[PDB]
Scaffold this active site. Structure first.
Site, PDB file in Angstrom:
ATOM      1  N   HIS A   1     -51.621  17.572  54.929  1.00  0.00           N
ATOM      2  CA  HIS A   1     -50.845  17.357  56.160  1.00  0.00           C
ATOM      3  C   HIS A   1     -51.794  17.333  57.338  1.00  0.00           C
ATOM      4  O   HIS A   1     -52.981  17.571  57.191  1.00  0.00           O
ATOM      5  CB  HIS A   1     -49.782  18.469  56.346  1.00  0.00           C
ATOM      6  CG  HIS A   1     -50.376  19.807  56.500  1.00  0.00           C
ATOM      7  ND1 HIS A   1     -50.725  20.605  55.435  1.00  0.00           N
ATOM      8  CD2 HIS A   1     -50.788  20.447  57.600  1.00  0.00           C
ATOM      9  CE1 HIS A   1     -51.303  21.706  55.902  1.00  0.00           C
ATOM     10  NE2 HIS A   1     -51.373  21.624  57.210  1.00  0.00           N
TER      11      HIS A   1
ATOM     12  N   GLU B   1     -56.807  22.417  65.305  1.00  0.00           N
ATOM     13  CA  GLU B   1     -56.592  23.868  65.218  1.00  0.00           C
ATOM     14  C   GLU B   1     -57.922  24.590  65.358  1.00  0.00           C
ATOM     15  O   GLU B   1     -58.123  25.368  66.295  1.00  0.00           O
ATOM     16  CB  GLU B   1     -55.829  24.191  63.928  1.00  0.00           C
ATOM     17  CG  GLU B   1     -54.424  23.604  63.968  1.00  0.00           C
ATOM     18  CD  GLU B   1     -53.471  24.322  63.065  1.00  0.00           C
ATOM     19  OE1 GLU B   1     -53.783  24.573  61.882  1.00  0.00           O
ATOM     20  OE2 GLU B   1     -52.344  24.631  63.565  1.00  0.00           O
TER      21      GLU B   1
ATOM     22  N   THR C   1     -49.634  28.374  59.892  1.00  0.00           N
ATOM     23  CA  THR C   1     -48.205  28.371  60.171  1.00  0.00           C
ATOM     24  C   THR C   1     -47.622  29.664  59.556  1.00  0.00           C
ATOM     25  O   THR C   1     -48.186  30.210  58.562  1.00  0.00           O
ATOM     26  CB  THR C   1     -47.491  27.178  59.487  1.00  0.00           C
ATOM     27  OG1 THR C   1     -47.531  27.290  58.043  1.00  0.00           O
ATOM     28  CG2 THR C   1     -48.077  25.866  59.891  1.00  0.00           C
TER      29      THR C   1
HETATM   30  N1  LIG Z   1     -51.807  24.807  58.224  1.00  0.00           N
HETATM   31  S1  LIG Z   1     -51.941  25.513  56.822  1.00  0.00           S
HETATM   32  O1  LIG Z   1     -52.568  26.848  56.964  1.00  0.00           O
HETATM   33  O2  LIG Z   1     -52.549  24.625  55.861  1.00  0.00           O
HETATM   34  C1  LIG Z   1     -50.295  25.867  56.261  1.00  0.00           C
HETATM   35  C2  LIG Z   1     -49.624  24.679  55.621  1.00  0.00           C
HETATM   36  C3  LIG Z   1     -48.186  24.999  55.180  1.00  0.00           C
HETATM   37  C4  LIG Z   1     -47.914  25.687  53.840  1.00  0.00           C
HETATM   38  B1  LIG Z   1     -46.497  26.631  53.895  1.00  0.00           B
HETATM   39  B2  LIG Z   1     -46.593  25.141  52.931  1.00  0.00           B
HETATM   40  B3  LIG Z   1     -45.876  26.601  52.211  1.00  0.00           B
HETATM   41  B4  LIG Z   1     -46.802  28.008  52.764  1.00  0.00           B
HETATM   42  B5  LIG Z   1     -48.442  27.829  52.125  1.00  0.00           B
HETATM   43  B6  LIG Z   1     -47.072  27.322  51.126  1.00  0.00           B
HETATM   44  C5  LIG Z   1     -46.979  25.617  51.349  1.00  0.00           C
HETATM   45  B7  LIG Z   1     -48.569  26.303  51.181  1.00  0.00           B
HETATM   46  B8  LIG Z   1     -49.190  26.398  52.828  1.00  0.00           B
HETATM   47  B9  LIG Z   1     -48.280  24.959  52.304  1.00  0.00           B
HETATM   48  B10 LIG Z   1     -48.097  27.415  53.823  1.00  0.00           B
HETATM   49 ZN   LIG Z   2     -52.368  22.962  58.467  1.00  0.00          ZN
END
Ligand SMILES: [N]S(=O)(=O)[C][C][C][C+2]123B4[B@@]15[B@]16B7[B@]89B1[C+]651B5[B@]8([B@@]512)B7493
Ligand SMILES: [Zn+2]
Length: 257
Positions: free
Chosen positions: A91, A103, A196
């Protein structure tokens, strides 16, 4: 529910997720002069030849491309990591204008966007178990600057009109994430967190030094996405980035001199 706005954004998240004020939060500013070259760090191993993309999805906080993670088809190993990490999804985070969106920052510089490839450690068997562990996830971060187009991004850009609003998804098979990678795998690494909610302290961050270039037309398509569901007041999906958090007692290590 959490978001990126004035009344529900990053400064509010600690109320539902108190680890937001923890000891190993992400992202951080990478101070390039303080990061220490570590000759013991290995080259990163990125093995994406057998990757199987499934779907593209607007989750109301970003868009993501999801992969089949039921086998070792698209894996990250080496670098700072022990063992084998499966690719779950990628993403992006981006801005309303080209001077913000990333970020991580580099000597306080913000990039127009940041790509995250999210991987989980096979030794914990599933991603829900992995988020509960300090070495559960490895996220590969890649900066985006605006200039020339990235040809390997265009397939993604061209379907974003079909997932405008929160909820929406589409088939997204046969997408090759190797087309999103810069030449060099030189990196910085440090122990941190999800950026997040739930902000779990489960991530080994691997941030590539070399940005990719994308065109203004490509990033403008990201900015047409909506945070809202269809039928609700239209709010552009822009500025979906968490700011840099305190480094506290951590060392950022460089793979390169
Ligand atoms: N920006 S980042 O730290 O890559 C978080 C990306 C979002 C995530 B929630 B979606 B849900 B929870 B863990 B789980 C999935 B794994 B990341 B992907 B966190
Ligand atoms: Zn991310």
């Amino acid at each position: 529910h959490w978001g990126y706005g004035k009344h529900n954004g990053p400064e509010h998240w600690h109320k539902d997720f108190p680890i937001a004020k923890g000891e190993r939060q992400s992202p951080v500013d990478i101070d390039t002069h303080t990061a220490k070259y570590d000759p013991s760090l290995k080259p990163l191993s990125v093995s994406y030849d057998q990757a199987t993309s499934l779907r593209i999805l607007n989750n109301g906080h970003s868009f993501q491309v999801t992969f089949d993670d039921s086998q070792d088809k698209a894996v990250l190993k080496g670098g700072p990591l022990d063992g084998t990490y499966r690719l779950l999804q990628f993403h992006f985070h981006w801005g309303s204008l080209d001077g913000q969106g990333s970020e991580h920052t580099v000597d306080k510089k913000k990039y127009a966007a940041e790509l995250h490839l999210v991987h989980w450690n096979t030794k914990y068997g599933d991603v829900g178990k992995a988020v509960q562990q300090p070495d559960g996830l490895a996220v590969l971060g890649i900066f985006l600057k605006v200039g020339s187009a990235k040809p390997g991004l265009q397939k993604v850009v061209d379907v974003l009109d079909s997932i405008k609003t929160e909820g929406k998804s589409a088939d997204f098979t046969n997408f090759d994430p190797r087309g999103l990678l810069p030449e060099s795998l030189d990196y910085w690494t440090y122990p941190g967190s999800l950026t997040t909610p739930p902000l779990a302290e489960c991530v080994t961050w691997i941030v590539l030094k070399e940005p990719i270039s994308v065109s203004s037309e490509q990033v403008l398509k990201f900015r047409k996405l909506n945070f809202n569901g269809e039928g609700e007041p239209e709010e552009l999906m822009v500025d979906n980035w968490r700011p840099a958090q305190p480094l506290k007692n951590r060392q950022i290590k460089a793979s390169f001199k």
